[PDB]
Design a protein around this ligand. Structure first.
Ligand SMILES: N[C@H]1CO[C@H]2[C@@H]1OC[C@H]2OC(=O)Nc1ccccc1
Ligand SMILES: N[C@H]1CO[C@H]2[C@@H]1OC[C@H]2OC(=O)Nc1ccccc1
Length: 340
């Protein structure tokens, strides 16, 4: 397709490109915030809940150690992440509010989403019913239609990266592997359980890898566990490239048919990567009850609302050792991060 969708995406690309070509920089500093709690950690950064001292607003602050970014070969990826986040705008993406750097670290200050990760709720309940999984899946389909139209690939879809907001809708966080890509790209990155066969085989790959990952996510939401799993990654990779996938008997026939077309090992036959693009997915029988405009407008009542007391409640996140945010007397890796 309808002209309203075509015109929506043309305007979205226009607005993205203006920010992409003139990124914002240096819009706050560390001592504007009080530190509250660590919400998660990793090899080269962590995420902390903070409170802005003048306004009282809460935020999730991602802190990356510049020297560890360089050593783990993530320079280009960290520059991709901040440039993309400062340029996008869509209902189901977390908003970037501030960014800045100092002698030691890079900082990205995001909206705080207090309901926690979809992964926690999935494991507490066991599995989601098909209507519940389908509500979340429709939001990811729309978000990928938006990102792919901007020539972006997301490359890290998994339940840990989908936060649940106060109204029960998804907010996608972590753009650490996202990239603007005209054609193909080649980096090995992602989480093993979610990787498409063409990534594992070191091929040049495209946006079809996000549609494969959506197949893995929908299977995991409806079954309670992902389709390909093992103790060592090499064993996971062998199952993925065979693509041999068994479905629980409680799966509907429509769900199995959709999953066979998303978890298609031949990328030239995979739903989302054919001539009709995303409409092969939106028009599939498993989505026949979905009102796509109502989801986009956030007019559907959600299947589940998280329990929390207020905008600063951390009870839906877990506990980590609290470490210092040190800032060196001397500047580190200045050249490498000039554009940040
Ligand atoms: N979590 C982000 C995204 O929604 C919130 C928040 O940031 C401000 C507000 O932004 C939007 O509602 N964005 C939008 C709306 C319609 C079409 C395209 C983009
Ligand atoms: N989203 C989580 C779960 O899948 C990914 C990711 O974390 C690592 C990996 O974990 C599993 O494959 N879990 C599993 C496998 C079989 C039975 C029960 C659980």
């Amino acid at each position: 397709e309808q002209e309203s969708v075509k015109e929506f995406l043309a305007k979205a690309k226009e607005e993205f490109l203006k920010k992409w070509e003139s990124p914002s920089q240096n819009t706050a500093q560390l001592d504007h915030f009080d530190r509250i709690k660590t919400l998660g950690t990793g090899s080269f950064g962590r995420v902390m809940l903070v409170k802005h001292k003048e306004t009282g607003n809460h935020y999730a602050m991602k802190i990356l150690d510049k020297q560890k970014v360089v050593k783990l070969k993530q320079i280009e990826h960290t520059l991709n992440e901040k440039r993309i986040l400062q340029a996008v705008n869509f209902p189901f993406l977390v908003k970037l509010e501030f960014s800045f750097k100092d002698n030691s670290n890079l900082y990205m200050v995001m909206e705080y989403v207090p309901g926690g990760e979809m992964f926690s709720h999935l494991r507490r309940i066991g599995r989601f019913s098909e209507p519940h999984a389908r509500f979340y899946a429709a939001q990811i389909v729309l978000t990928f239609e938006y990102l792919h139209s901007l020539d972006l690939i997301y490359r890290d879809l998994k339940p840990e990266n989908l936060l649940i907001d106060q109204q029960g809708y998804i907010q996608v966080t972590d753009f650490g592997f996202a990239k603007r890509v005209k054609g193909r790209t080649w980096t090995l990155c992602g989480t093993p359980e979610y990787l498409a066969p063409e990534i594992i085989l070191s091929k040049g790959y495209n946006k079809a890898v996000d549609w494969w990952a959506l197949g893995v996510l929908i299977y995991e939401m409806a079954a309670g566990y992902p389709p390909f799993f093992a103790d060592q990654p090499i064993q996971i990779y062998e199952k993925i490239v065979s693509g041999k996938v068994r479905f629980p008997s409680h799966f509907s026939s429509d769900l199995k048919d959709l999953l066979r077309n998303l978890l298609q090992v031949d990328l030239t036959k995979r739903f989302g990567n054919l001539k009709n693009g995303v409409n092969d997915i939106k028009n599939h029988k498993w989505f026949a009850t979905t009102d796509w405009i109502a989801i986009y407008q956030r007019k559907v009542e959600a299947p589940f609302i998280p329990k929390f007391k207020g905008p600063g409640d951390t009870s839906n996140f877990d506990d980590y050792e609290e470490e210092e945010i040190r800032v060196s007397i001397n500047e580190k890796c200045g050249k490498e991060f000039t554009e940040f």
